[PDB]
């Protein structure tokens, strides 16, 4: 955990930091204050504020850079003032800033520290990169020892080991003020924010963009890389994540990887998932798993009312029960709750699992089916209503069809379907296949519309429907498909050797062939959902895959990959010397 944030406003609270993501502010600290944690601090993005402190020495021996992105009094990167006690002999007398090579922006202020010394000996211009910044270092300690012979009149403390080393030099107008020497060849690396040791990307005192383990780099190692054998982008085995301004192989203590950077929490669009020890943020591809409390016993809320309903948006699984009572539907005026808007019931079109029960005794008159509970597949029944019921549908005068289009299971409980005098299709339903264990006696179906009256008007299941029955009218409202299934809709055949969107089958379910396959006639277009399972490529073929275009500039482990299409539209590779891409296979065919 190298990088930690720094205070904004200027007992003792400490951070064992390396890189300070903000300002280092040491204000009102005791004479007997142990500052061993400061010994690892090398970089300060903001400023250093050392005001009114009784400790005899400030030890920051690793501090090499103060970025000065944030500045104290809008003028300084280093502000050292009043670090002395008026009556007590205890006062700041030495600044251990030996390794302070530079201040990227901002100025320097070192005043009113009655016993602080050796500051007048230091060449601040060899530190302060900012040409137009101010340097105020007066009114400090007096009668102090001269800089030890080995420190040529420049030192941070009296000791032979603590002297100020000069790093700044005159830069040639080919360096842009970044050089390790005066010669035009002695220019700095593009990624140094400041000065040099030498020309290499490692020799920087501060990185302009990122620090990938010693070397200042613009980009943190890319997460995907084109694989020549696999003919596609693959996770790069050299990947590092952006934890602050540092490139990190692993994400720190409870930090989830997202996109390419180390993050504190997962975005709404993604979900936390472990894979190979690292916790990454995988995209959901639509809706992410959400858990809502619910109604019934144990819960605060009694019925799905106009106020509580909004707290079920994007909810895929309810950790409780659902109660649709007249009190919530028509609204309770005793505790000033308004009537429920029917268009607001469309928040359950996302619900897939109910841990407990689903009680529906009230429903809008223009809503003739439970079409909102379409995505509902399984009902747990951990908590049960009345005598031990999981599914309760009674006294619903204007319900024509059940509408539970994709329900496959009800783990535990009892069925209750009564007084829905307008309800049909439920007769044909094979409850033995839906409810686990014995359905003997624990099935309640009475006082609804009888089959005789359903058949007479034409209220019967589709011919494409199986022996198991149906949820309502049409091919879509089926429990099981006789032949094939489309998007839940029972179909005769998939579009195998004919049709606009071409398909393939898997467990009697039709799935469309990848957009890149060529529509084949008299034979299958694909034998899988893959861009590689095609019979023919409608555009180009990059190895096993049918592609929209040939790889051109896709980064590989060994550099950018450029390929051109064949006469047979196949992605053949460009010549090694084509740095921009190519028309054909020769060197004469290089692009530029």
């Amino acid at each position, epitope marked *: 955990q190298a990088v930690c944030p720094g205070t904004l406003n200027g007992y003792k609270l400490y951070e064992r930091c390396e890189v300070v993501m903000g300002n280092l502010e040491i204000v009102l600290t005791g004479h007997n204050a142990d500052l061993s944690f400061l010994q690892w601090i090398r970089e300060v993005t903001g400023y250093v504020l050392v005001a009114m402190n009784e400790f005899s020495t400030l030890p920051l021996p690793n501090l090499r850079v103060v970025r000065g992105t944030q500045v104290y009094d809008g003028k300084f990167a280093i502000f050292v003032m009043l670090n002395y006690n008026t009556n007590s002999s205890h006062a700041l007398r030495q600044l251990r800033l030996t390794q302070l090579t530079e201040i990227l922006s901002g100025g320097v202020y070192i005043e009113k520290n009655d016993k602080l010394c050796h500051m007048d000996t230091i060449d601040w211009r060899d530190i302060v990169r900012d040409r137009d910044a101010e340097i105020v270092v007066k009114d400090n300690g007096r009668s102090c020892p001269p800089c030890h012979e080995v420190c040529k009149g420049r030192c941070w403390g009296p000791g032979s080991e603590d002297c100020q080393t000069l790093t700044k030099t005159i830069c040639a107008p080919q360096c842009n003020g970044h050089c390790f020497g005066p010669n035009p060849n002695q220019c700095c690396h593009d990624e140094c924010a400041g000065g040099c040791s030498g020309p290499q990307d490692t020799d920087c005192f501060a990185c302009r963009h990122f620090n990938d383990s010693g070397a200042c780099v613009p980009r943190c190692p890319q997460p995907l890389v084109y*694989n*020549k*054998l*696999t*003919f*596609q982008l*693959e*996770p*790069n*085995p050299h990947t590092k994540y952006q934890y602050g301004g540092v490139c990190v192989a692993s994400c720190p203590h409870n930090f989830v990887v997202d996109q390419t950077s180390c993050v504190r929490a997962c975005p709404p669009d993604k979900m936390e998932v472990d894979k*190979n020890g690292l916790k990454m943020c995988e995209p959901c591809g639509g809706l992410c798993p959400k858990a809502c409390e619910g109604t019934g016993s144990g819960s605060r809320f009694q019925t799905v009312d106009s106020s509580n309903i909004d707290g079920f948006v994007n909810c895929t699984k309810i950790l409780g029960n659902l109660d649709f009572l007249i009190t919530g539907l028509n609204g309770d005026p005793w505790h000033k709750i308004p009537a429920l808007d029917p268009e607001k019931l469309n928040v359950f079109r996302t619900v897939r699992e109910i841990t407990g029960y689903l009680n529906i005794q009230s429903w809008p008159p223009h809503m003739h089916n439970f079409s909102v509970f379409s995505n509902l597949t399984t009902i747990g029944g951990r908590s049960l209503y009345n005598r031990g019921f999981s599914l309760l549908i009674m006294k619903n005068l204007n319900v024509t069809s059940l509408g539970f289009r994709s329900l496959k299971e009800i783990s535990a409980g009892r069925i209750y379907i009564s007084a829905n005098r307008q309800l049909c299709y439920h007769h044909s339903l094979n409850w033995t296949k839906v409810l686990r264990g014995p359905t003997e006696e624990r099935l309640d179906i009475k006082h609804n519309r009888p089959r005789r009256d359903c058949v007479a008007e034409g209220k019967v299941c589709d011919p494409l429907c199986s022996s198991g029955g149906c949820w309502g009218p049409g091919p879509g409202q089926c429990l099981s498909c006789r032949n094939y299934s489309r998007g839940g809709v029972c179909v005769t055949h998939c579009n195998f050797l004919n049709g606009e969107p071409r398909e393939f089958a898997h467990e009697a379910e039709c799935f469309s062939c990848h957009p890149e396959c060529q529509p084949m006639e008299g034979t299958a277009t694909c034998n899988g959902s*893959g861009s*590689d399972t095609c019979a023919q490529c409608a555009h180009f073929r990059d*190895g*096993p895959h049918c592609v929209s275009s040939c790889p051109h500039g896709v980064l590989g*482990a*060994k550099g950018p990959i450029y390929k051109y299409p064949d006469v047979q539209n196949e992605c*053949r*590779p*460009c*010549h*090694e010397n084509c740095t921009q891409g190519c028309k054909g*296979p020769e060197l004469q065919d290089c692009l530029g």
Partner: antibody
Amino acid sequence: VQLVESGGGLVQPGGSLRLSCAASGFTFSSYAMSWVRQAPGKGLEWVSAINSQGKSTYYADSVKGRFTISRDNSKNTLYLQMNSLRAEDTAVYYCARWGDEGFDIWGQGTLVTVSS
Amino acid sequence: DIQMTQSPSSLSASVGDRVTITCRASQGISNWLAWYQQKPGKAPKLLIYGASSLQSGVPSRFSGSGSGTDFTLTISSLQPEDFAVYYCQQYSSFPTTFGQGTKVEIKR
């Protein structure tokens, strides 16, 4: 950095065999892997490849519909589930790693012998 | 598919001689060729990737060359150790294909 094959013995024709390649000394999880077979005493023949994640698997035509490539990135092992084994499948089966370019690291190879 | 045809199949040369191996690919392959060494009863060892690019810690005597179809593997000064069968590998096309090998042995 090493790979260790296992399971390559003797199967009767029409038989079944699950080969196993134990990866060590590297992040197995991060590299696309392959099986390469060598019938005595002939040349090299790429037999199957697998995606780093394992989402995408590719088989050479000779082996398709019979062998199945897989990997358990937790157990740090790779597998080749060869089915309906033909005599023509007797080979030494090398499990190799696709590096940044080329098969950089290879196992010792296990010898499968299809015989009655 | 791309057929890889190596030449010669067997090669005999004295220790110190400049040994050359060729490789022609049925179709265009750029510089996407790998060279392997296979000493008896051992797994192949990757010598050259790219087509001229040398693998880490492979003796400097080994060198590669070429682009598109015709390729060359060269051993600057043939060594006793160098006895093995050498393979080709195109990785520009699916399936990846190898050569038949060039059995290089010492004339002593």
